[PDB]
Design a binder for this molecule. Structure first.
Ligand SMILES: CC(=O)N[C@H]1[C@@H](OP(=O)(O)OP(=O)(O)OC[C@H]2O[C@@H](n3ccc(=O)[nH]c3=O)[C@H](O)[C@@H]2O)O[C@H](CO)[C@@H](O)[C@@H]1O[C@H](C)C(=O)N[C@@H](C)C(=O)O
Length: 428
């Protein structure tokens, strides 16, 4: 697309907003940038020639714009932004800008849990085939920074927020891995509205890949994956495609059923994107996992300290707890900004004599109320760690799986996971 001479306004001075500033500058367009945060993180890195407005949205800028580029962290329902939409002013996000520019097939992945794992796996499968692949999006590397003429395949992790502002995505293969309650602070029409954002990923997708065990992943036919059913399903555990064994999961470094269905989803996408299955299976055997995703950061004196800081919603923490074997006591850390989630689905995991909860952050009290007689509540994760650490015995597990966003107290979930790992190494 061509932006020359257009009045471009970017909302968001984070990672996305900075990559858009550079995008436009490289195209001979100086945008203006605003953010409702008084001192947003990207303020320091903004080129000096770019006008910026912080502490609020600027309606004079918004109503004057030819194009508004909204970072995923601003709600389209923001009254300033709905006013501009009502005036007919075009509003896109960075993924939309990317789709207009990208000149290779895109594999697009969203879901409440499993997103980064499946995105990375497809990237590894591409690489195993010798394909020049760009991997980014919500996984952390702004998509516009992937744009490269030598690139042969793009693998995008996409959030519901990013999908809301995207209209030009025509994925070669698209999946919603699963839909579970998240971001309810951004969706006042609840689960179905959230689901509706995610369902945009299927629009104009050549192959849609659905979770046969999750009805909400299906369009209101798709290739399916599931546990007992699906085109890609599980059979010691085997990955199968239509009844034929393709991989004994003992070859995988990843474990857990939810990761075997992740592997199925990734293989489905890779097959649809045309990647050779043999090299795709190869990548499945090499991939060791992601940082902050059920990551053992210390195993010492018969205790494992596990960094699952990436568990920022209830479904993710369920995937940690569901089927979890612990020889002694599980010391479970929960806490942060729960984004108005119902935490009560976690209750069925917290029974018995071998569980201790340490709840912190903004929604610490609602987390501790899950089972009051086994729960401590502190203000911070550090206080919680120093509380639990004396109590830890050989055989125990210490699990940070906080079911919450970290934004109330931390820069991001990575920072939260790093601080846990330092304290584990200190106290363990
Ligand atoms: C909230 C969000 O969608 N974050 C994704 C985004 O990061 P970026 O730094 O660009 O975010 P942003 O849009 O500036 O928003 C960050 C924070 O700033 C706040 N913010 C943002 C703009 C504004 O004017 N006002 C304001 O208060 C937001 O509400 C949010 O609390 O773009 C990055 C590159 O694509 C992503 O990696 C990053 O995903 C993270 C890791 C995430 O938490 N995503 C959510 C959606 C999730 O996975 O569930």
């Amino acid at each position: 697309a061509d932006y020359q001479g257009k009045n471009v306004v970017i909302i968001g001075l984070g990672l996305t907003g900075l990559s858009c500033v550079d995008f436009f500058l490289a195209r001979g367009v100086t945008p203006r940038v605003m953010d409702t945060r008084m001192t947003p993180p990207g303020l320091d890195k903004l080129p000096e020639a770019v006008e910026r407005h912080t502490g609020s949205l600027n309606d004079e800028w918004l109503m004057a714009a030819d194009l508004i580029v909204a970072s995923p962290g601003i709600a389209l329902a923001h009254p300033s932004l709905s006013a501009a939409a009502d005036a007919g002013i075009e509003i896109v996000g960075d993924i939309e800008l990317f789709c207009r520019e990208a000149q290779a097939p895109i594999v697009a992945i969203t879901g409440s849990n499993g997103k980064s794992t499946v995105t990375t796996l497809v990237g590894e499968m591409a690489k195993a085939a010798g394909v020049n692949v760009g991997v980014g999006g919500n996984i952390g590397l702004p998509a516009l920074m992937l744009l490269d003429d030598e690139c042969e395949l793009y693998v995008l992790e996409l959030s519901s927020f990013q999908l809301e502002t995207t209209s030009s995505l025509q994925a070669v293969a698209a999946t919603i891995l699963n839909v579970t309650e998240d971001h309810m602070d951004r969706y006042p029409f609840g689960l179905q509205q959230y689901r509706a954002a995610k369902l945009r990923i299927y629009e104009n997708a050549k192959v849609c890949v659905v979770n046969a065990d999750d009805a909400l992943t299906m369009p209101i036919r798709c290739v399916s994956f599931g546990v007992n059913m699906g085109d890609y399903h599980l059979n010691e555990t085997w990955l199968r495609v239509k009844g034929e064994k393709v991989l004994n999961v003992k070859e995988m470094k990843l474990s857990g059923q939810h990761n075997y269905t992740n592997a199925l989803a990734a293989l489905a996408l890779a097959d649809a994107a045309g990647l050779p299955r043999a090299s795709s299976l190869k990548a499945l055997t090499t991939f060791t996992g992601l940082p902050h995703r059920f990551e053992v950061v210390l195993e010492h004196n018969g205790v494992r300290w596990i960094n699952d800081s990436k568990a920022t919603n209830v479904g993710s923490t369920e995937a940690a707890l569901n089927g979890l074997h612990v020889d002694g006591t599980l010391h479970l850390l929960l806490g942060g900004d729960g984004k108005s989630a119902d935490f009560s689905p976690l209750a069925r995991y917290l029974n018995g004599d071998n569980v201790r909860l340490y709840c912190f952050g903004r929604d610490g009290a609602q987390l501790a109320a899950l089972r009051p007689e086994v729960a401590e509540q502190t203000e911070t994760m550090e206080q919680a760690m120093r509380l639990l650490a004396p109590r830890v015995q050989p055989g125990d597990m210490v699990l940070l799986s906080p079911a919450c966003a970290s934004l109330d107290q931390f820069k991001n979930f990575e920072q939260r996971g790093n601080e846990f790992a330092r304290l584990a190494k200190e106290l363990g």
